[PDB]
Structure 1
Amino acid sequence: CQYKIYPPLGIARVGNGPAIKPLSLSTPEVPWAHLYDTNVQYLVTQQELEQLLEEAFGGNVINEISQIKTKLKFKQEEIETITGLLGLSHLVPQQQLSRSLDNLEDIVQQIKGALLKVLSDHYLHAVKKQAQNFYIYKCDEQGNPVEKLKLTDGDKVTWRVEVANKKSFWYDYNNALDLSLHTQGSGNLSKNVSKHRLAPAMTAKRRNPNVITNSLRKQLVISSQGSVSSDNNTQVPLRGKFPANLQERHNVLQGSIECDNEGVLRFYAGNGISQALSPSSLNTDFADNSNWFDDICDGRVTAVVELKNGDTFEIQDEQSSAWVATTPPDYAPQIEPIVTMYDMVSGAALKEQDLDNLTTQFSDVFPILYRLYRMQWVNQADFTDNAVNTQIRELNSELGFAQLLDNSASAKSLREGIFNQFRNPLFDQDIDVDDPSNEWVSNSRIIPSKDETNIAAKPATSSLKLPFYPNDGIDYPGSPVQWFAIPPFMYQHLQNWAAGDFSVTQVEKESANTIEELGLFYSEQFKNSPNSALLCARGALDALYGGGFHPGVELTWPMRHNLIYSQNDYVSSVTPEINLLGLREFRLKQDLQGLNSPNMYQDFGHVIAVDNVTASIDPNSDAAWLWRSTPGDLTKWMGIPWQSDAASCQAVYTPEDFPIPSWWAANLPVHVLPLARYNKFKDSQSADLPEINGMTHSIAQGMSEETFEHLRLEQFSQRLDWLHTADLGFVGYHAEGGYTNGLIQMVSQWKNMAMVMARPVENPGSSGIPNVVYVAYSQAD
């Protein structure tokens, strides 16, 4: 094996910002690189648009304009030429540029402000696209990547991308089918779930069931493809049609691809446009809306390397090819899911029966506590109702966090007290057994169905364990799987840590007086690790959620099975002495024919059931195509349109007020700290401003210092429902609000929801506010 594409699974997120480098973001290539960066801009700013508009001037534009100043309200020929020089038609439709100059009568400044207005109307505060860079690495015998391909004069690389969307073709998502799949157990899912029927898989009917026959259902699949090479950096759109080909027919931009002269591919996702074929078809289910399409996609990334001597190298086989999937936006890029999709890859390689052979370092346990700690910026329960985060604050306040790194007997009660608050993914604690035919019924707090029964609830006898998030089995009141547990292999690390059977280096202890100090240390280990190919493989997936799956945010339950990977190998620790959950070489199973595969349009008839998944396990079976992905196969399970998924990915209220359960808050926040509050605690009393923290200078400085600091903390403590950062049907007199209006309005409002960004507090003083806060920006404020 000679050349390989990295990452093996790239991720690009939709946004309404433009598909150009200065105004777009890049999928992380190094884990934890950006956690405290207070300069991040995830929304398009006025400053970025102004700079873009300066860049488009002259070009001899000023003189070309000035020469008609002398020659004369414009003429068509005059406008047609002036607009041409700007080269702004790829951002805004040509006509609107013309209409903008037509309303005119220093002439450059009238031209600039008029053009700034049309750019601003289209893009100001827009959600920036998160694009994926793909790299070709030269490899060894044994396929170890050693360095990126360096093109010399006469060398060329050509990339090929073929993507599809099959959501409208596939089946309803009622729950994860693998919940009833017979198994010996993996690092991701205990065998108890299926064995004791804790959350039975449901059958699922076809989406758009009125379209009958396989031949006609092919119209429900949106697909496109394109090629770019290092000899031309022009961007190529990936554009399909729905329905595909008196049928009214829509163009669907599934993405855009770009290659630079060094040979790296940049993949942009679509604009986030979801639509029904009729305006009257509203998306009133969280996942399964007929007559709808969206611009999400996924597919196959291949390349061919042409060296100057004539040597040709095809990057086409599954061990060296790559995949790309597009997903909803990440509304808190610096807040990491507690369990990530990378953790699912790692857990899929492990058998539950072998988790006793796992070896544990503290750096394998720290991510759980650190991520849970940082959930405070997106979830109220983890800010004010999480006893583990409060204890971490206690330890930080006396610079005593390093005790958690002590594996000795004197610290065990400290370690065990924390460990005992976490939910066991065996799902066999806090249960009473009916008929010890068994049924395991939780004696902890259940999440009720909306379908009420006016009969007294059974009082809970055991405490609710961590984390306070719903899970795959939420449909089933009293199932232990209603609630999320860190997967078996991560719970094993935590159990080894509690028992003292873990190792840690002295250098880690010396950087561990507070959780943030150690988080910064581990961030530096990632930064300096020399395996850029595998770090970029991991960075693509560490921002993605890895559960619960109902269906999820970006991807869903097939990813937690080793069946979907053609390769999944442990290679090394991140650092020689520090594992940090490790680095892995993994690849998706791919159908090498892509869009031309005869299995492109397979299904299981009127319903899909776990029986079909059972049949698919044998790779020689007729159902094994389920795991050999063709384009569209990774994202077809997700909700259609995705905005319905996201609007349903929020809080699930229990009869008890607190803690409030939340689904996927790290990427779709539930409770956020608005900009409006940031501006009311950001300043110190000495600030040289006519307004300080929303008070007049005079009032701010007349009050006692402690009272000033108390007001800062009160403002810092005001968290706003994320669903309220845009108009989701609750605005106005007699507004109905409610869940369903959330689903309907999110189709248009997803791009106005608040975006969480790290920001500085220069002088917290004794207020208790950290020097870095995570602040939600929306135009609702």
Structure 2
Amino acid sequence: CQYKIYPPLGIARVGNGPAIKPLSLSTPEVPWAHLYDTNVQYLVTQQELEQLLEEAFGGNVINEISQIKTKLKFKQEEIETITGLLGLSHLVPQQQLSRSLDNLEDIVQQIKGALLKVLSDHYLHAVKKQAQNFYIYKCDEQGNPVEKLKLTDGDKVTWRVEVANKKSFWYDYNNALDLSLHTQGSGNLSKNVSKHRLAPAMTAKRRNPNVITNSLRKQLVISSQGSVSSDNNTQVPLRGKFPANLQERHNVLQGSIECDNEGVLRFYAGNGISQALSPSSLNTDFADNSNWFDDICDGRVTAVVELKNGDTFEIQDEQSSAWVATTPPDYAPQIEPIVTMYDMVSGAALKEQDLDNLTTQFSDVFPILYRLYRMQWVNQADFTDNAVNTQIRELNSELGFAQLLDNSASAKSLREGIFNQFRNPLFDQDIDVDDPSNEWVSNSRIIPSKDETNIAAKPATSSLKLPFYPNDGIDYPGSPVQWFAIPPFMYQHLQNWAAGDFSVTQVEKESANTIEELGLFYSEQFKNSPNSALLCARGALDALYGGGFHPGVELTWPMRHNLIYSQNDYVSSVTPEINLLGLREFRLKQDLQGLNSPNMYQDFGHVIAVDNVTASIDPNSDAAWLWRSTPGDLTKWMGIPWQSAAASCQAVYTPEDFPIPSWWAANLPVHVLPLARYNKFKDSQSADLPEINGMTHSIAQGMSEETFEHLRLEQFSQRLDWLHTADLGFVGYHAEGGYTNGLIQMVSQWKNMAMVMARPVENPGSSGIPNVVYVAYSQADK
């Protein structure tokens, strides 16, 4: 094996920002690289548009104009000339540029302001696309990536991408089919779930069921493809049609691709446009809405390397090819899910029975605590109702965090006290057994169905364990699987930690006086790790959610099965002495014919059921196509359109007020700290500003220092429902609000939802506010 594409699974996220480098973002290629970066700009800024518009001037433009200032309200071919000169037609439709110079009458400033206005209207505050860069790496006499391909004169690389969306063709998402799949257990899912029927898999009917026969259902699939090479950096759109080919048809931009002269491919997702074929078809279900399409997609990434000496190298087999999937935006990019999609890859390789042989370092346990700690910025329960996060604050306040790194007997009760609060993914605790036919009924807090029964609830006898998030089994009141547990292999790490059976280096201990100091240390370990290919593979996936799956945010339950990978091997620690959950070489199973596969349009008839998944396990079986992905297969499971599923991915209220359960808050926040509040605690009393923290200079400085600092903390503590950061149907007199209007309105309002970004507090004084806060920006403001 000679050349390989990284990452093996690339991720690009939709956004209404433009598909150009200066105004877009890049999928992480190193884990934890920007966690505290207070200069991040995830929304298009005025300054970026102004720079873009300056860049587009002269060029001779200044005196190509001034030349007709003398030669005179403009003409067409007068203006047609002075458009075009600014290469701005690829950002705004040509006509609207013309209409903007029409209402005109120093003139190379009436020209700018008029053009800035149209750029601003289209893009100001827009959700920047998160594009994925793909790289070719030269390999070894062992398939080990050594260095990126360096093109010399005469060398050429050609990328090919083929993507599809089959959501409108596939089945309803009622719950994860693998919840009933017979298993011996993996690192991601205990055999107890299926063995004891904790959350039975449901049957699922077809989406768009009125379209009958396989031939006609092919129209429900959106697909496109394109090629780019290192000899031409022109961007190529990936454009399909829905329905595909007196049928009214819609163009769907599934993505855009670019290759630079060094041979690196950049993949942009769509613009975030979802639509029904009729305006009156409303998307009132979280996952299954007929007559709808969206611009999400996924598919196959290949390349061919042409060296000058004639040598040609095809990157097409599943060991060296790659995949791409597009997803909803990440509305808090610096806030990591507690269990990531990379954790699912890692867990998929492990057997539940062998978790006794797992070896644990503290760096394998720290991510759980660090991620849960940082959920405070997106979820109220983790800010004010999480006893572990408050204990971490206790330790931080006396520079005592390093005690958690102590594996000795004197710290055992400290470690155990934290470990004992976490939910056990065996799902066999806090239960009473009917008929020890056996049913496991939770004696902790359940999450009720909306379908009420006016009968007294059974009092909970056992505390609610951590984390406080719903899970795959939410449909079943009293199932332990209603609530999320870190997966078996990660729980094993934490159990080994509690027991004291873990190692840690002295150097780690010396950077561990607070959780932030240690997180900064580990971030440097990623940054300096020399395996850029595998770090890039992990970084693509460590920002994605890895549970619960109902269906999820980006991808869903098939990813937690080793069946979906053609390769999944441990390679190494991140650092010789520091594992940090490790680096792995993994590749998806792929159908090598791509869009031309005869299995492109397979299904299981009127329903899908776990029996079909059971039959697919055998790779020689007729049903094994389920795991050998063709374009569209990773995302077809997800909600159609994604916006409704995102609006449904929020809080699930219990009769008890607190803690408020939240589904996926790290990527779809539930409770955020608005910009309005940041502007009321940002400043110190000494600030040289006529307005300080929303007060007149005179009032801010007249109050006592203690009172001034108390007001800061009060503002800092006001967290706003993320669903209220744009108009989701609750605005206005007698507005209905409610769940369903959220689903409907998210189709247009997703691009106006608050985006969380790290920001500085220069002098918190004794206020208790950290120097880096995570602030939610939306136009609802303030």
Please state how far the C-alpha of 1:223 moved relative to its aligned partner: 0.2
Structure 2 residue 408 is the aligned partner of structure 1 residue 408: yes
- What are the within-5 Å matches in structure 2 for residues 424-503 of structure 1? 424-503=424-503
Structure 2 residue 391 is the aligned partner of structure 1 residue 365: no
Superimposed CA distance per residue, residues 108-165 of structure 1 (whole angstroms, 9 cap, x where no aligned partner) = 0000000000000000000000000000000001100000000000000000000000
Paired with 1:139 and 1:650, the residues of 2 have a C-alpha distance of 44
Paired with 2:719 and 2:529, the residues of 1 have a C-alpha distance of 37
Please state how far the C-alpha of 1:639 moved relative to its aligned partner: 0.3
- What are the within-5 Å matches in structure 2 for residues 54-453 of structure 1? 54-453=54-453
Q: Which residue of 1 aligns with 2:582?
A: 582
Superimposed CA distance per residue, residues 528-581 of structure 1 (whole angstroms, 9 cap, x where no aligned partner) = 000000000000000000000000000000000000000000000000000000
Please state how far the C-alpha of 1:510 moved relative to its aligned partner: 0.3
Paired with 1:123 and 1:720, the residues of 2 have a C-alpha distance of 25
Please state how far the C-alpha of 1:665 moved relative to its aligned partner: 0.1
Please state how far the C-alpha of 1:84 moved relative to its aligned partner: 1.1
Paired with 1:115 and 1:407, the residues of 2 have a C-alpha distance of 63
Please state how far the C-alpha of 1:628 moved relative to its aligned partner: 0.1
Paired with 1:86 and 1:407, the residues of 2 have a C-alpha distance of 64
Query: 3-state DSSP class of the match of 2:143?
Result: coil
Query: 3-state DSSP class of the match of 1:759?
Result: strand
Please state how far the C-alpha of 1:364 moved relative to its aligned partner: 0.1
Please state how far the C-alpha of 1:302 moved relative to its aligned partner: 0.1
Superimposed CA distance per residue, residues 186-241 of structure 1 (whole angstroms, 9 cap, x where no aligned partner) = 00000000000000000000000000000000000000000000000000000000
Query: 3-state DSSP class of the match of 2:69?
Result: helix
Superimposed CA distance per residue, residues 409-457 of structure 1 (whole angstroms, 9 cap, x where no aligned partner) = 0000000000000000000000000000100000000000000000000
Query: 3-state DSSP class of the match of 1:101?
Result: helix
Paired with 1:246 and 1:131, the residues of 2 have a C-alpha distance of 36
- Percent same amino acid among aligned pairs? 100
Query: 3-state DSSP class of the match of 1:624?
Result: helix
Paired with 2:470 and 2:308, the residues of 1 have a C-alpha distance of 56
Query: 3-state DSSP class of the match of 1:169?
Result: coil
Q: Which residue of 1 aligns with 2:561?
A: 561
Query: 3-state DSSP class of the match of 1:751?
Result: helix
Paired with 1:664 and 1:75, the residues of 2 have a C-alpha distance of 54
Please state how far the C-alpha of 1:624 moved relative to its aligned partner: 0.2
Superimposed CA distance per residue, residues 261-302 of structure 1 (whole angstroms, 9 cap, x where no aligned partner) = 000000000000000000000000000000000000000000
Query: 3-state DSSP class of the match of 1:632?
Result: coil
Please state how far the C-alpha of 1:39 moved relative to its aligned partner: 0.1
Paired with 1:55 and 1:506, the residues of 2 have a C-alpha distance of 52
Please state how far the C-alpha of 1:764 moved relative to its aligned partner: 0.2
Please state how far the C-alpha of 1:732 moved relative to its aligned partner: 0.2
Superimposed CA distance per residue, residues 673-697 of structure 1 (whole angstroms, 9 cap, x where no aligned partner) = 0000000000000000000000000
Paired with 2:236 and 2:324, the residues of 1 have a C-alpha distance of 16
CA RMSD of aligned residues (A): 0.2
Paired with 2:16 and 2:400, the residues of 1 have a C-alpha distance of 45
Paired with 2:138 and 2:97, the residues of 1 have a C-alpha distance of 46
Paired with 2:495 and 2:75, the residues of 1 have a C-alpha distance of 76
Please state how far the C-alpha of 1:636 moved relative to its aligned partner: 0.1
Paired with 2:773 and 2:284, the residues of 1 have a C-alpha distance of 36
Please state how far the C-alpha of 1:372 moved relative to its aligned partner: 0.1
Paired with 1:537 and 1:84, the residues of 2 have a C-alpha distance of 40
Paired with 1:511 and 1:748, the residues of 2 have a C-alpha distance of 46
Paired with 2:121 and 2:390, the residues of 1 have a C-alpha distance of 44
Paired with 1:195 and 1:228, the residues of 2 have a C-alpha distance of 50
Please state how far the C-alpha of 1:645 moved relative to its aligned partner: 0.5
- What are the within-5 Å matches in structure 2 for residues 682-701 of structure 1? 682-701=682-701
Query: 3-state DSSP class of the match of 1:35?
Result: coil
Superimposed CA distance per residue, residues 38-95 of structure 1 (whole angstroms, 9 cap, x where no aligned partner) = 0000000000000000000001000000000000000001010001100100000000
Paired with 2:229 and 2:639, the residues of 1 have a C-alpha distance of 34
Query: 3-state DSSP class of the match of 2:490?
Result: helix
Query: 3-state DSSP class of the match of 1:167?
Result: coil
Paired with 2:703 and 2:74, the residues of 1 have a C-alpha distance of 59
Paired with 1:293 and 1:139, the residues of 2 have a C-alpha distance of 40
Paired with 1:524 and 1:721, the residues of 2 have a C-alpha distance of 34
Paired with 2:157 and 2:410, the residues of 1 have a C-alpha distance of 60
Paired with 1:415 and 1:252, the residues of 2 have a C-alpha distance of 53
Please state how far the C-alpha of 1:15 moved relative to its aligned partner: 0.1
Paired with 1:510 and 1:658, the residues of 2 have a C-alpha distance of 37
Superimposed CA distance per residue, residues 457-493 of structure 1 (whole angstroms, 9 cap, x where no aligned partner) = 0000000000000000000000000000000000000
Superimposed CA distance per residue, residues 342-363 of structure 1 (whole angstroms, 9 cap, x where no aligned partner) = 0000000000000000000000
Please state how far the C-alpha of 1:709 moved relative to its aligned partner: 0.1
Q: Which residue of 2 aligns with 1:45?
A: 45
Query: 3-state DSSP class of the match of 1:347?
Result: helix
Q: Which residue of 2 aligns with 1:717?
A: 717
Paired with 1:63 and 1:568, the residues of 2 have a C-alpha distance of 61
Q: Which residue of 1 aligns with 2:639?
A: 639
Please state how far the C-alpha of 1:502 moved relative to its aligned partner: 0.2
Query: 3-state DSSP class of the match of 1:11?
Result: strand
Please state how far the C-alpha of 1:740 moved relative to its aligned partner: 0.3
Paired with 1:779 and 1:44, the residues of 2 have a C-alpha distance of 13
Query: 3-state DSSP class of the match of 1:145?
Result: coil
Query: 3-state DSSP class of the match of 2:113?
Result: helix
TM-score (norm 1): 1.00
Q: Which residue of 2 aligns with 1:529?
A: 529
Q: Which residue of 2 aligns with 1:19?
A: 19
